[PDB]
Design a protein around this ligand. Structure first.
Ligand SMILES: [Ca+2]
Ligand code: NA
Ligand code: NA
Ligand code: NA
Ligand code: NA
Ligand code: NI
Length: 567
């Protein structure tokens, strides 16, 4: 028994609604066109309710949730609705970033730091922002990582059947002022608490214990200072770059580019790659900078560029960092438990894992599966070919972490980006790698393309086949439709990519990702000869690409005669 006082209690409102059929989140949350969440009636409310209902009402009552966004248009409105419906659903406290700004890694860090039950991240990553752009809602769980396939099924089940939802429509929240905002609610004893927190502080504190900030600051300052351009692409990472790389680590202000978060990302796709980070590439090509980097909208993906815009392939970045973790105080003290990569990612890191005698895991695309490997201590470091890298310091990929680990390696090795990569190739060989994206193709054609290709590579005699393109020859070693049985919780992921492994240390992978679908073709060829480590990837891999387009017959089936994007 307890007694207390209230003043002007905010009422709770129940609303009759109708379920939607498509409110199941994908691998990176539920993404729709912004107008769907903004104007389709009760669409936003239905999904927030379903997300909150996926938490046991006894664990839910009096719990804490973290909320953050990448800053895109509509984020503030979604946050307000989220606050009004968390209050109405018995949530004890919300920790929200200043101005609604929290990077995906920061959310993951804060969830774990304060032992929250989970968090909602409002981001559509690389996809454009604005009224006619895209909007997404990610849900992370208590370990700070993406929701497992089991919680997704729960969220879906509730969304299909949701008949009502609860909300406090009269509640208003000010995201601009740091500090606590308590609310007396009808039928709630304890006041409902909203903490507006600095977007960067707690996340920065985590990094300060991981890295040697003195070594990094020495690299960025002094007469022999690294000249550097870091482009947050007008997304969430702006304040993180300024507060951490400039203020704390001493980088000059002109190193921070597009570091004002914008609701439309400045009218550009917040996608860190050679195709869309054209401003960074043009600056790096001038030859004036020894290090470049771009982040995506929510700050978990990162492109690394060397002097003269030397492109560090994400699969090479993974292997290079894995081979130099000893340069980092964190890993010197806690050790390296194991590595993990998504199956489409190049096998470069596998060669590092072999030399170091550490386990390497091969997972489906998506960070969901790295989390169990980290939670169980099987893995300490992992990454994906899609510009993603991370460690067990959180349960999300981390772009700024990727920059700091690279700077730490450069400072400790007294070398630039290109020399580190080329030395790495000399030591272990080079895994030539590229990815073709065929975007927004007829999902009907995509279906039959994969169905037919799966039948081809599954034929009994396919392992006895060999292919010739010009003077090059490739002999099928094994081929399958990739499957992953989670070694921790037993989750089974089927149809995770068609894979052809050739005898001549080469691979082809086919993955099927609005209405349209995306087919991704990955090609990999290993080169041991150190004198053949400066060929153009499209030349080395041309033959394998030709095989891919032929056996898949993608150009005919889709009417395209070329990929949309090449990485
Ligand atoms: Ca064979
Ligand atoms: Na994300
Ligand atoms: Na994305
Ligand atoms: Na508090
Ligand atoms: Na991919
Ligand atoms: Ni992202």
């Amino acid at each position: 028994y307890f007694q207390s006082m209230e003043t002007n209690p905010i009422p709770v409102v129940t609303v009759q609604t109708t379920p939607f059929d498509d409110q199941k989140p994908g691998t990176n949350g539920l993404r729709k066109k912004t107008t769907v969440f903004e104007s389709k009636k009760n669409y936003l409310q239905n999904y927030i309710q379903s997300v909150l209902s996926s938490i046991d009402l006894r664990d839910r009552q009096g719990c804490t949730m973290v909320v953050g966004s990448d800053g895109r248009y509509f984020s503030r409105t979604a946050i307000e609705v989220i606050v009004q419906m968390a209050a109405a659903n018995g949530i004890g406290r919300l920790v929200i970033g200043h101005n609604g700004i929290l990077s995906t890694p920061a959310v993951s860090c804060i969830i774990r730091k304060i032992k929250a039950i989970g968090g909602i991240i409002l981001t559509a990553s690389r996809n454009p922002g604005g009224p006619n752009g895209d909007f997404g809602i990610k849900f992370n769980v208590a370990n700070g990582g993406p929701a497992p396939d089991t919680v997704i099924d729960k969220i879906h089940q509730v969304s299909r059947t949701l008949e009502e939802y609860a909300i406090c429509p009269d509640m208003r929240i000010d995201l601009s002022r740091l500090g606590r905002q308590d609310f007396d609610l009808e039928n709630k004893f304890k006041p409902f608490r909203v903490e507006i927190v600095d977007s960067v502080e707690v996340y920065l504190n985590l990094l300060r214990g991981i890295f040697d900030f003195n070594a990094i600051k020495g690299l960025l300052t002094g007469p022999d200072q690294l000249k550097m351009r870091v482009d947050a692409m007008s997304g969430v990472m702006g304040p993180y770059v300024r507060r951490i790389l400039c203020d704390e680590l001493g980088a000059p202000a002109n190193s921070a580019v597009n570091c004002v978060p914008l609701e439309d990302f400045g009218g550009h796709y917040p996608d860190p790659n050679l195709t869309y980070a054209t401003g960074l590439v043009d600056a790096m090509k001038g030859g004036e900078f020894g290090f470049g980097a771009a982040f995506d909208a929510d700050g978990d993906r990162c492109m690394i560029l060397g002097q003269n815009a030397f492109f560090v392939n994400p699969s090479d970045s993974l292997a290079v960092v894995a081979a130099n973790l000893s340069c980092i105080p964190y890993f010197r003290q806690v050790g390296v438990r194991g590595f993990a990569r998504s199956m489409p990612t190049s096998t470069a890191i596998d060669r590092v894992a072999k030399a170091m005698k550490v386990a390497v895991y091969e997972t489906p695309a998506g960070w969901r599966f790295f989390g169990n490997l980290m939670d169980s201590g099987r893995c300490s470091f992992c990454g994906e070919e899609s510009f993603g890298m991370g460690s067990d310091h959180i349960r999300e990929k981390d772009g700024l972490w990727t920059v700091l680990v690279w700077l730490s390696i450069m400072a400790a090795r007294k070398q630039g980006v290109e020399d580190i990569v080329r030395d790495h190739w000399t030591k272990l060989g080079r895994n030539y790698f590229c990815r073709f994206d065929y975007e927004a193709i007829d999902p009907r054609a995509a279906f039959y393309l994969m169905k037919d290709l799966e039948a081809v590579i599954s034929d009994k005699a396919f392992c006895s086949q060999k292919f010739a393109v010009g003077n090059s020859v490739y002999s099928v070693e094994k081929a399958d439709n990739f499957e992953y049985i989670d070694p921790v919780d037993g989750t089974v992921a089927r149809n995770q990519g068609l894979r052809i492994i050739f005898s001549e240390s080469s691979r082809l992978i086919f993955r099927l990702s609005g209405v349209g679908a995306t087919i991704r073709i990955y090609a990999e060829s290993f080169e041991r000869d150190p004198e053949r480590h400066n060929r153009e990837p499209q030349v080395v891999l041309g033959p394998l690409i030709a095989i891919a387009l032929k056996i898949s017959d993608i150009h005919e089936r889709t009417g395209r005669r070329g990929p949309t994007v090449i990485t």
